[PDB]
Amino acid sequence: QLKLGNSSIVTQEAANICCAYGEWPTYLKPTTSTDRFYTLKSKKWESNSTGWWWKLPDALNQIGMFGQNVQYHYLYRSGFLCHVQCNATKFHQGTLLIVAIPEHQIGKKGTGTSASFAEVMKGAEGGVFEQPYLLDDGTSLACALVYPHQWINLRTNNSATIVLPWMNSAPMDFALRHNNWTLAVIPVCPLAGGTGNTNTYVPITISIAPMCAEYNGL
Amino acid sequence: QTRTVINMHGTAECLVENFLGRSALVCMRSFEYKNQKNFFIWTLNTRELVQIRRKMELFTYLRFDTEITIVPTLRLFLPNLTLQAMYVPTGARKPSSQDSFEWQSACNPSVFFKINDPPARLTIPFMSINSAYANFYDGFAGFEKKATVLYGINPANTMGNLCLRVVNSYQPVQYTLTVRVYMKPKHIKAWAPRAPRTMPYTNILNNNYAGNAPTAIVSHR
Amino acid sequence: TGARKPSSQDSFEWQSACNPSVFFKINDPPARLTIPFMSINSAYANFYDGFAGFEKKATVLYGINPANTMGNLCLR
Amino acid sequence: QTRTVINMHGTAECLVENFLGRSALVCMRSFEYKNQKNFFIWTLNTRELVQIRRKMELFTYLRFDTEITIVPTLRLFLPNLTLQAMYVPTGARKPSSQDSFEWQSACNPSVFFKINDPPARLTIPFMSINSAYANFYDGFAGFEKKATVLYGINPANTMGNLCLRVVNSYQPVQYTLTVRVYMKPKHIKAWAPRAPRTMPYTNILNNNYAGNAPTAIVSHR
Amino acid sequence: GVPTCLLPGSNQFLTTDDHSSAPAFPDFSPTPEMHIPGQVHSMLEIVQIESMMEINNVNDASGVERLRVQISADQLLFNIPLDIQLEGPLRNTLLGNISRYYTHWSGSLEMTFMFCGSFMTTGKLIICYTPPGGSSPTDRMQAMLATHVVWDFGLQSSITIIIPWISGSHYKAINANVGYVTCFMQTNLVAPVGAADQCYIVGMVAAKKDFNLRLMRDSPDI
Amino acid sequence: GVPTCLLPGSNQFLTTDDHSSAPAFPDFSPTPEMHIPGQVHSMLEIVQI
Amino acid sequence: GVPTCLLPGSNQFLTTDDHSSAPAFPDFSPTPEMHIPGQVHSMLEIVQI
Amino acid sequence: LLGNISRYYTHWSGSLEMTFMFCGSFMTTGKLIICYTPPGGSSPTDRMQ
């Protein structure tokens, strides 16, 4: 039962919580009770789904005291603890690949113009892959394992944990229009809980905790 | 169908420094001269040539010092013309024309050479505001919620511009001068390697893929 | 060895970021390169009592070690 | 409308030596040659180019050793003509014409180069009688209460003159030779910084301001 | 003064020379660097990172469907050549993409097969490795003789097979051939009334610390 | 005699190069300097004012 | 800077010169060598046969 | 001096000190509220802000 600040979340950790590139997040004039777990809206993992993605600073611009500080303060610097729970019975099957892409430049298909502020900055709602196979990046899903990756296998491994440090080429950056990380949950193998489709949902639960958070300018 | 018995070697060849860090022909612009314009302007970016663009886009962040080597070439329809290569950093007005006041500056570094001389070199140090070049940027240059501000362009990532002027532009002969630019990174430090790209390119300002098909990379068996 | 040869003078292979090259002019001293010991095999074999391929066909030439190739030089 | 997170640096860039002390194109004189005159005469002063003039006028007193680099340029309507750059110190008669006895002197230093050769350099040491150059002078050159003596000209501040002669002046071809002069101070020591100037210039001999208006510098809100 | 002599190869532009050219900015200090996470010193460190492979690279497979092999209701399941330039399963992998920048390569591999079925479902596969030269197996009897592992879903979720050091080069053009890896249905696929009859297997490949890339060349991918 | 090799970027005029060029006056002594008040070493000292 | 003087016989190609020319591959390692039997150091060893 | 010197430099960063001097009589008295709004925040319009 994990708990940061006031909020708590019940976990099912059974293996070492791997830190992204083995660096535990830390903060180093700038600087405090907003370091708490935010559980995003549950997402339906249908058999015909493609894949979801949340931009963490974008995802937390409007959520509680963290959102209030980001709207008030001109800068930020924050690590992210991402907990993903695919909730299903022993009967269900499939594989979720959780990839924390650094600087995931969204790429439209068969257009000249780039993605606008609307298509990129979903916020708390999160986005959906048009082409999961190409990560909407020109890359391959086969090559997506270079990034901090984990597997939710509906057999054995029913939850994933990612610990993202401050990945940016500046000590601090802006949350309003920059996205250091992109947490992408992609179904590698389609959900096949063949119970006559009594409940095809098998919803995914995302929980983001901004750790070692500091800001500049009150 | 093969005869390969490869003995074990060292890791010298597979260094990032030896991979990214060597000269590559990025710019091959030509200019006619006949009976005011046709000066050389070039934005410093690794995205112009597809091969080096993919090789650089293998990594997220990387620092280097850039050796820019300019090779002149004269193509008459050889006189030893004087060439001036001026490296204008970001935030300085670009030369409006060949006969522009910006050339006669006391702040913009430049080199004077001639055709018969060895090709010119400059080493521009790690120039960006940001503590490392970002090949990809999941943000916006400005704060305006308008199409005027382009997506995925860090304005700190600009390395400045290089402007070459043929001082002896007005000559008795009609010809073409072709400038070759060679870019060589030095002391390369790389962080957060990216997934190698598969599909072709559209433009330097954007990462759109058109399409080895977009639904299948490998030629199906 | 194992790189596509320049198809013509105006070929993309010249504008490569992987093939080493030298730029000189006529009045300049003659150009030099020092290609290190380049073969896969730990020494050049002047004679080879074998075959390049496995096919029992005239397509595969006799007494040619494909590791012995030192590469090609292309002047433009 | 901006993305600026600038990390703390050293004070190397903001040194006075690195500010004033680097090459600047001060003189760009041209000379026709066709079917006795059109020799190059230039007074050594920092006041010819407005940008470097303001940058120098930021300080009252300053000592330096001057690197003068001459870049030749031939413009035919290229033959390797011989150029002689003679540095005549203050108090020596100036070359009356191209074919003048002053060129054949045993006291005036000079350099012999040609067009295809690298551009010529001299380093004239700190040359003034006075122990430092004064950009501003609140006095008179002479004692006469007459308009003949100019106001605010220290006659010790003169660095001497540079005279370039094209030895191969008489040639079968009609052309133009353009001389570029680059001035680079060295070991700069500055004293008593002045208020930065705002308004434009009229002449090198005087500090008159004509007029961003003379009653208001900043464009009014 | 001091004598000097312009050797042949002087006044030439070697495109791979390394010398300290005259600095454009003499006393300028670049922006100080700090600890950016995920430091990499060589591409040999990149190939260490495992990557997913297109085992099901048939024309009927479109998009992510190419990355998973179907298994459901004792026939051959899949075959994979170890050639990393024969536009096989290995082409898309970090191994393939990085190695196609190098003409000469040699080293051992580790292949991880992960099962994507239900918790209740159980079965057996036989995964055999055929060294180079030997014809790829066609029947269980050939598979049961070669260096193989009996992978069980019931006990072990994902299996790892270490392929000993292999080599190949493109260098006339006759290409190259290296050993195969094959999977045969040891038993039926046991699934209760709840779990779906269909199941998927996903492939993963990485290079051990013994891998080496020697001669750098341009990749013909683009 | 001693070998030497003219590297690329030789016989070029870098406008920001720093080298000890041949002295116009070899043994001439500049006018000795004395303590002029108001010494400044950097523009970062000027902005302090 | 440092003076130098181009001696006669400079800018010539001696066909029997021996100097360390600029390496085509700067940090490339050639294939390691092992003990090949029948080492020969001179043709004076060949005539012994 | 800050503006004039800094306009010679593209990249700049550092803290400032602003001195406000009153030019009224000795007898005259009053109060002002001087507020600093960090970057991004809209400039204040009322005493409460």
Author numbering:
A (entry chain B): 15 to 42, 52 to 54, 58 to 244
B (entry chain A), D (entry chain A): 49 to 83, 92 to 133, 143 to 276, 282 to 291
C (entry chain A): 155 to 230
E (entry chain C): 1 to 73, 78 to 175, 183 to 233
F (entry chain C), G (entry chain C): 1 to 49
H (entry chain C): 98 to 146
Give sentences from the paper.
Enterovirus 70 (EV70) is a human pathogen belonging to the family Picornaviridae. EV70 is transmitted by eye secretions and causes acute hemorrhagic conjunctivitis, a serious eye disease. The capsid of EV70 is composed of the subunits VP1, VP2, VP3, and VP4. The major capsid proteins of EV70 are organized with pseudo-T=3 icosahedral symmetry, with VP1 subunits forming pentamers around 5-fold symmetry axes and VP2 and VP3 subunits forming heterohexamers at 3-fold axes of the capsid.
The structures of altered and empty particles of EV70 were determined to resolutions of 3.7 and 4.3 Å, respectively. The altered particle lacks VP4 subunits and is expanded 4% in diameter compared to the native virion. The expansion is enabled by the loosening of contacts between the pentamers of capsid protein protomers, which is accompanied by a reduction in the interpentamer binding interface from 3,350 to 2,750 Å2. The first 48 N-terminal residues and loops BC (residues 84 to 91) and DE (residues 134 to 142) of VP1, loop AB (residues 43 to 57) of VP2, and loops BC (residues 73 to 78) and GH (residues 170 to 172) of VP3 are not resolved in the cryo-EM reconstruction of the altered particle. Amino acid residues 49 to 56 from the N terminus of VP1 cross the capsid of the altered particle of EV70, resulting in the exposure of the N terminus of VP1 at the surface of the altered particle. The N termini of the VP1 subunits pass through the capsid approximately between a 2-fold axis of the altered particle and the canyon. The externalization of the N terminus of VP1 is enabled by a conformational change and a shift of the GH loop of VP3 away from an interprotomer interaction interface. The pocket inside the VP1 subunit in the altered particle of EV70 is collapsed, as is also the case in altered particles of other enteroviruses that were characterized previously. The collapse of the pocket of EV70 is enabled by the movement of VP1 strands B, C, H, and I into the pocket. The altered particle of EV70 contains approximately rectangular pores of 17 by 4 Å positioned on 2-fold symmetry axes of the capsid.
